[PDB]
């Protein structure tokens, strides 16, 4: 009932967003948006959720985030030696030592996290970026210059390697965000975007650039598909030849698939060799 | 006349740069260099300019920037929790809230911009880097861990996606900088360097690494070229086969070309599909 | 004798690491670990070393670093506008202006370096990351969003281009770290990881993703190899065709090899053309 009331305020405001402005926003509404941001930040709200074995999206959460961008004023952020200027608060500002201990997260300087992103215990953030609305479950490693984009869902024990990006999905509203399920390895410099889902136990090698337009070639079956890496897939960068053989175009290739039992026994290097 | 006098000081100093030093620089010259840096920073000077339909370069502006690197001393930059040490001032230091409002730029923490780069209103800098001499026109999105290199010219409404880089061109003096014209999309992890020009309305997909040595294959015509993406081109990563078929080498492929009318109607995803 | 005593303390502690903890660490041991960290930071210890023409690794140095991660407590790092939370000190904190001058390093804001990494004079760090245990020799350029990973050995006059990463190797203990020898060029967005060695005078082009599982095709000889770029190699991204020709998979291609005499005369662009 309480969340149904909060959702209602958000949806009615979003409906007439085209006649709202920073100078004209209900004080009760700016409070409501901040209530949703707080729930996203502490994990009690999450933008997408696996329900009855299906990933589902909560559009009203995206609407609250979209409304924060429209209605919140930019303010100076004073770093001493320089200034920034933005409207989205950072996650770790008034955080005490106890609170950091209780969180179980390591935030390596100078990793940057916006408020409205949840990050579970035993996660390590190397210098990296986590955007508003993201949900990072337990035991995740976010390596240097990686990016966890808006609303992205990162599962337990996922390894996002150096310079790898998980693309944000705030619009369209009905789109599932980019989802990396439990125990996935994302290799360095890869980029998984636009609501692609990488299912459980997958291994993505280096330089895999995977969006909704990227052909996925399954070399075992010979099928070409889009938008989903099935569970336990080993994925490498490849090419597909032209019809006349004059050239080839970039694609992702599924070179093997591995059950959970095997995934715990064989190393990533052996899987790619 | 006033700018012709300023240019003269810069050129005469640059001529005898090999006998200048940090301890021996005219006080009037360090002022002149700073006058050019100020004009670059507020957009009244720009390193390259489209004149009579041709992009042209102002070598004397590069010479001023080169002289700043030679003559300016490094100084401590105190970030409180650590120190840096460099000779190029940052753009946003003594900036007031009013000045940030007047600029119309959002500088998301912790985006870093050197002084001597111009950034026009309605631009959003995610955590990213903009180097000295760059010119970023109105409405540009610089996404997370993107880079706008020295002297780069970024047109209106350009989208530089996450982890994409626009390479700097300070030397050679006569070289046009890397130029991205109006309404271009630069896909994630791409890198456009070494004075390549991407003309108006082009769409560059992910993982396109494009420099002066990169073959550009036009699959419509079959031509191979270098250094220029014609207006309205859709560009993806590809390969070109060996003469004996033993291997292939990386290249960029122009897979379609689109007029301005079509460019506003069809989405980027549909263009790449 | 003094270093043999220090090594002994480290090795005996590492042996019974599984029964050590942050709350139970010898005060004399936390001092010993800090002595090794200091020696790594000032270059008097280095994790790997070329001895009698062979690169060798000092496992006990890695053990000290591993013990710092286990035993050092996380602490708040106060950046004023936000906080971080980590257990590894930064290299440049109490550094004076004189010390920065004496170091000969430029640390461009906001490049981040952990303590326990050595960086020699005439090196320039653009905003980038250098991890604990790395050794960066004289005259190196680390460009924007590059990464020098843990224990990596970077030779004199190496150029790590924008967005390029040198992968860390802390485990396995016996593995040589990723090694880039003198006068190598590492092109933008490339990633050299997992203890690959790039020998002297090599030129690596853009988008080269090179780990222990990456096939290296030598187009002059036709040989496929792993883990080593021989001295003077020019390396570009390529593909290798499927046995049935349905697809190809990513690889690195050695397209030329160049002696030291030629390497100083011919430009990188001419080498790749």
From Swiss-Prot, chains A, B, C:
Belongs to the transferase hexapeptide repeat family. Transmembrane segments: none annotated. It catalyses: (S)-2,3,4,5-tetrahydrodipicolinate + succinyl-CoA + H2O = (S)-2-succinylamino-6-oxoheptanedioate + CoA. It is found in: Cytoplasm. The gene is dapD. GO terms for biological process: diaminopimelate biosynthetic process; lysine biosynthetic process via diaminopimelate. One of its GO terms (molecular function) is 2,3,4,5-tetrahydropyridine-2,6-dicarboxylate N-succinyltransferase activity. HAMAP family: DapD. It comes from Legionella pneumophila subsp. pneumophila (strain Philadelphia 1 / ATCC 33152 / DSM 7513). This is 2,3,4,5-tetrahydropyridine-2,6-dicarboxylate N-succinyltransferase. Homotrimer. The keyword Repeat applies. The keyword Manganese does not apply. Substrate binds at residues 106, 143. Keywords: Acyltransferase, Amino-acid biosynthesis, Cytoplasm, Diaminopimelate biosynthesis, Lysine biosynthesis, Repeat, Transferase. GO terms for cellular component: cytoplasm. Its main location: cytoplasm. Pathway: Amino-acid biosynthesis; L-lysine biosynthesis via DAP pathway; LL-2,6-diaminopimelate from (S)-tetrahydrodipicolinate (succinylase route): step 1/3. SUPFAM superfamilies: Trimeric LpxA-like enzymes (SSF51161). Its EC number is 2.3.1.117. It comes from the Bacteria. InterPro entries: DapD_Trfase_Hexpep_rpt_fam, Hexapep, THP_succinylTrfase_dom1, THP_succinylTrfase_N_sf, Trimer_LpxA-like_sf.
């Amino acid at each position: 009932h309480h969340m149904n009331s909060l959702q209602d305020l958000i949806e009615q405001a979003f409906e007439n967003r085209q006649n709202l402005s920073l100078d004209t926003a209900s004080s009760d509404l700016i409070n409501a948006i901040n209530e949703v941001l707080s729930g996203l930040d502490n994990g009690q709200f999450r933008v997408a959720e696996k329900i009855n074995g299906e990933w589902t999206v909560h559009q009203w959460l995206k609407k609250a985030v979209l409304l924060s961008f429209k209605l919140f004023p930019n303010q100076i952020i004073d770093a001493g030696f320089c200034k920034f200027y933005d409207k989205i608060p950072l996650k770790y500002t008034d955080c005490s030592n106890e609170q950091f201990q209780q969180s179980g997260v390591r935030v390596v300087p100078h990793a940057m996290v916006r408020r409205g992103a949840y990050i579970a215990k035993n996660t390590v953030l190397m210098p990296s970026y986590v955007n508003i609305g993201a949900y990072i479950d337990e035991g995740v490693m976010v390596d240097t210059w990686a990016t966890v984009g808006s609303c992205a869902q990162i599962g337990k024990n996922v390894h996002i390697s150096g310079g790898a990006g998980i693309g944000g999905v705030l619009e369209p509203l009905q789109a599932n965000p980019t989802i990396i399920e439990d125990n996935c390895f994302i290799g360095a410099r890869s980029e998984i975007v636009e609501g692609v889902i990488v299912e459980k136990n997958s291994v993505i090698s280096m330089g895999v650039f995977l969006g909704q337009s990227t052909k996925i070639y399954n070399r075992i079956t010979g099928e070409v598909s889009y938008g989903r890496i099935p569970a336990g897939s080993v994925v490498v960068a490849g090419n597909l030849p032209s019809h006349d053989g004059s050239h080839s175009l970039y694609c992702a290739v599924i070179v093997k698939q591995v059950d959970e039992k095997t995934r715990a026994k064989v190393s990533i290097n052996d899987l790619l060799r």
